[PDB]
Amino acid sequence: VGTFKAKDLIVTPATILKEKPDPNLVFGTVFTDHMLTVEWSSEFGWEKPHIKPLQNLSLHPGSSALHYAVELFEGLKAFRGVDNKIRLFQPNLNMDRMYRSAVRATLPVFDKEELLECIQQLVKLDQEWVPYSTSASLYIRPTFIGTEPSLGVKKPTKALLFVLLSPVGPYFNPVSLWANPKYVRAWKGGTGDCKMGGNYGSSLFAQCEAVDNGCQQVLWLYGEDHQITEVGTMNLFLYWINEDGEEELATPPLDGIILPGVTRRCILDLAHQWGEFKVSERYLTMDDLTTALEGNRVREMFGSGTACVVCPVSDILYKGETIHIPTMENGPKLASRILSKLTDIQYGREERDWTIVL
Amino acid sequence: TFKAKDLIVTPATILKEKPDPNLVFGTVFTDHMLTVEWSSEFGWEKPHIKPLQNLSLHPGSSALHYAVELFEGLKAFRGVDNKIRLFQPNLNMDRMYRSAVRATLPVFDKEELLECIQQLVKLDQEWVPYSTSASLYIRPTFIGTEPSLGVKKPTKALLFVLLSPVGPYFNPVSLWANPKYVRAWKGGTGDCKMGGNYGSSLFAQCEAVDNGCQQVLWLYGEDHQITEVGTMNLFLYWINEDGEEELATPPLDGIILPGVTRRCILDLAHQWGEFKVSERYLTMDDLTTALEGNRVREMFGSGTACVVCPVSDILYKGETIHIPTMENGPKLASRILSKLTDIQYGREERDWTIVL
Numbered sequence: 178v179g180t181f182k183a184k185d186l187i188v189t190p191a192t193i194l195k196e197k198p199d200p201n202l203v204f205g206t207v208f209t210d211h212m213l214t215v216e217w218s219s220e221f222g223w224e225k226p227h228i229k230p231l232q233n234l235s236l237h238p239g240s241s242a243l244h245y246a247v248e249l250f251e252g253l254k255a256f257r258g259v260d261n262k263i264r265l266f267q268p269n270l271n272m273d274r275m276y277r278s279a280v281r282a283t284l285p286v287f288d289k290e291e292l293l294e295c296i297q298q299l300v301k302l303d304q305e306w307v308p309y310s311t312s313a314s315l316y317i318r319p320t321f322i323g324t325e326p327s328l329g330v331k332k333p334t335k336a337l338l339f340v341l342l343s344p345v346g347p348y349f350n351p352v353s354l355w356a357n358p359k360y361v362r363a364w365k366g367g368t369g370d371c372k373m374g375g376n377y378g379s380s381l382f383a384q385c386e387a388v389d390n391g392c393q394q395v396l397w398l399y400g401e402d403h404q405i406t407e408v409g410t411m412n413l414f415l416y417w418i419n420e421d422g423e424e425e426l427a428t429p430p431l432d433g434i435i436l437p438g439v440t441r442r443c444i445l446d447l448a449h450q451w452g453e454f455k456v457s458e459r460y461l462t463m464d465d466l467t468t469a470l471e472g473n474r475v476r477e478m479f480g481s482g483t484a485c486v487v488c489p490v491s492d493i494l495y496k497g498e499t500i501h502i503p504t505m506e507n508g509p510k511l512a513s514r515i516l517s518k519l520t521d522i523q524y525g526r527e528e529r530d531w532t533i534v535l
Numbered sequence: 536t537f538k539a540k541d542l543i544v545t546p547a548t549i550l551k552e553k554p555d556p557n558l559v560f561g562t563v564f565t566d567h568m569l570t571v572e573w574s575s576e577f578g579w580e581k582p583h584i585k586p587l588q589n590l591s592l593h594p595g596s597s598a599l600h601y602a603v604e605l606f607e608g609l610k611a612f613r614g615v616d617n618k619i620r621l622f623q624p625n626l627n628m629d630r631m632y633r634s635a636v637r638a639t640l641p642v643f644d645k646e647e648l649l650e651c652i653q654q655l656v657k658l659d660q661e662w663v664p665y666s667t668s669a670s671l672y673i674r675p676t677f678i679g680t681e682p683s684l685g686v687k688k689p690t691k692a693l694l695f696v697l698l699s700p701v702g703p704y705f706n707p708v709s710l711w712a713n714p715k716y717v718r719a720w721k722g723g724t725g726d727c728k729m730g731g732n733y734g735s736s737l738f739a740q741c742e743a744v745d746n747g748c749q750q751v752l753w754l755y756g757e758d759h760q761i762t763e764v765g766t767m768n769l770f771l772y773w774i775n776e777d778g779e780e781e782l783a784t785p786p787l788d789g790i791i792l793p794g795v796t797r798r799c800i801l802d803l804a805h806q807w808g809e810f811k812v813s814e815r816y817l818t819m820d821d822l823t824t825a826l827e828g829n830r831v832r833e834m835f836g837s838g839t840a841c842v843v844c845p846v847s848d849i850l851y852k853g854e855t856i857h858i859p860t861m862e863n864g865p866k867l868a869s870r871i872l873s874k875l876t877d878i879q880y881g882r883e884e885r886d887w888t889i890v891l
């Protein structure tokens with residue numbers, strides 16, 4: 178029972194550094210010169226955190242992360258603002274979610290402040306990788322895995338916490354969605370509300386089946402009434418005129434099968450803040466969708482996430498039929514506004530608690 | 536696909552001493568392992584049988600981030616005639632292959648993989664315990680080693696096999712039944728040995744442990760269907776609602792993993808023909824109602840690690856529900872255990888075993 182502390186950081190600089198890429202960058206493909214690694218054991222607990230040259234992990238073949246998916250991750254960004262100050266966006270929320278995930282995965286808890294500071298140091302050393310752009314950023318990937326060498330399924334007595342850095346650009350460009358009720362992403366009583374690796378491996382089949390039909394992503398449906406939950410691995414937002422005739426920004430509620438995105442939260446806070454229209458966390462089914470469509474009640478639909486921020490949807494292939502979404506034929510005003518707002522806050526073109534400097 | 540004919544063998548320079556057959560499941564490993572690299576641009580590399588060593592993986596490998604991984608479990612047994620046998624190995628190759636497809640991992644020639652495994656076990660054959668109550672556990676593992684963080688079909692992967700001598704896993708177990716957690720769901724992948732299905736079980740499993748139990752009784756649906764005993768297929772031996780003696784186990788509707796042991800037990804039950812054999816749904820209420828009527832005789836889980844694992848108690852709604860398995864023999868559990876072990880250790884010759 179304890180934690181590692183940033184003041185104990187053991188930094189080992191890379192002798193040979195790599196050349197930065199061109200800001201104009203396939204997501205998660207390029208990695209910086211250094212990484213963060215912290216060992217753990219139930220015997221001695223957390224060791225001293227290390228910032229060393231990016232290298233391969235040396236894992237026992239029996240590591241529980243390779244057999245029973247004892248792992249979890251996070252994804253946040255650092256932005257080199259217009260005032261050229263490197264900033265983090267709502268990092269503390271990422272530390273809160275990662276912690277909640279480590280517990281749900283039975284992985285060893287840690288001090289969020291210490292980790293966030295270790296991440297600060299790691300990004301500081303490689304601050305030059307933070308894209309000298311305004312449409313690019315630095316992707317931060319915290320990863321927690323069980324390295325228990327035994328094959329028995331149980332709480333790991335060994336784990337490794339690491340952080341990778343990758344400069345990224347994009348990921349508008351409306352997307353087509355593949356809606357097949359035969360596949361379910363999360364279930365009540367499952368781990369769909371956590372960022373645990375196990376919830377992602379089983380979706381590759383659906384994804385491939387998605388591209389096989391010109392769709393860039395999967396629209397995850399759930400239950401008898403086919404509630405629409407998430408766009409691929411992005412939270413789903415629906416801007417429309419509800420059943421009562423009111424202008425509304427809707428999104429599925431956090432009832433266990435939806436991941437509580439940091440971007441989802443921010444979009445909700447902004448929406449409430451403006452008070453220009455009803456904001457509701459409610460259930461949305463395909464029928465609610467189609468009925469609204471054949472009434473011209475829909476305006477926009479988009480997914481939200483750290484990677485895309487705001488990703489417009491234009492089509493849903495459902496029951497062998499392409500259902501068009503007027504998202505683009507309506508601006509998308511709401512979606513563009515939200516992008517500007519967050520972008521302004523991310524790159525320093527506007528002050529707000531949501532960001533941190535260093 | 537890789538060919539067993541291209542195996543590159545690098546024997547360990549120093550051999551480890553064999554453990555006492557005592558043995559804690561999957562904690563001791565043999566001298567060698569099988570590794571086969573795959574890439575999207577070149578396909579499979581040649582298979583390597585080399586000394587047990589750590590895996591050097593790029594920190595971005597999808598197996599660490601998105602659970603792009605699956606695994607298998609089977610055993611080698613030293614016969615009473617000293618012949619080492621594999622039990623239904625081709626069924627594991629089949630299941631592993633199906634899982635590979637559902638996981639979007641590269642396909643391989645089932646027969647070639649088996650031959651590579653046979654050769655690995657042959658090299659470390661002295662590890663196959665000289666006991667009729669111990670065996671050599673075989674762990675084929677398939678992981679995606681895609682370097683990029685984008686979520687997609689891997690362009691790089693690794694297939695490896697570890698060997699581990701093991702003893703047990705009748706020590707009746709008590710199960711913890713809490714509907715709040717769900718092992719797998721319709722539309723899911725609970726019918727595959729993909730890593731993802733296990734990581735989410737640890738929280739419930741630990742809750743079962745600090746609550747006086749050793750395994751989780753996985754419940755599903757509004758009517759609380761009893762699906763599996765921990766990660767072992769569930770069997771109920773009783774007199775059903777029609778008053779018929781019956782051996783029942785949940786149907787393969789998608790939330791149940793098709794265990795080889797499960798299929799074998801059903802096979803044996805059907806051929807003995809001494810009672811009704813049913814692949815059907817079983818709910819906590821069917822169970823409790825049956826207990827009150829004294830219709831339950833036995834309950835046990837089945838799996839490679841524990842061929843037959845009897846259940847004695849179930850903590851359900853704030854109460855401990857006793858299952859009379861042990862005071863009923865357990866006649867059928869024993870008979871079944873006896874039969875299967877006799878086949879595995881060669882006391883009986885059957886097509887379910889492959890020698891050397």
Ligand SMILES: *Cc1c(COP(=O)(O)O)cnc(C)c1O
Pocket residue numbers: 252372407409410411412436437438439440441481482483484
């Ligand atoms: C990571 C993730 C999101 C988005 O969360 P953000 O913190 O907003 O990046 C949404 N859905 C799923 C399933 C996710 O894994």
Ligand SMILES: *Cc1c(COP(=O)(O)O)cnc(C)c1O
Pocket residue numbers: 608728763765766767768792793794795796797837838839840
């Ligand atoms: C492996 C496994 C079983 C048992 O299958 P066998 O082929 O008999 O070893 C049962 N349930 C789950 C969830 C499993 O992973």
Ligand SMILES: NCC1(CC(=O)O)CCCCC1
Pocket residue numbers: 252409410411481482483484485684685686
């Ligand atoms: N849809 C993508 C992410 C989330 C996001 O940033 O929207 C989750 C899977 C791993 C890559 C990131």
Ligand SMILES: NCC1(CC(=O)O)CCCCC1
Pocket residue numbers: 328329330608765766767837838839840841
């Ligand atoms: N219940 C156990 C296993 C199966 C078995 O052999 O019963 C699956 C999880 C990994 C260890 C093996």
Ligand SMILES: [Mg+2]
Pocket residue numbers: 644646647
């Ligand atoms: Mg062939």
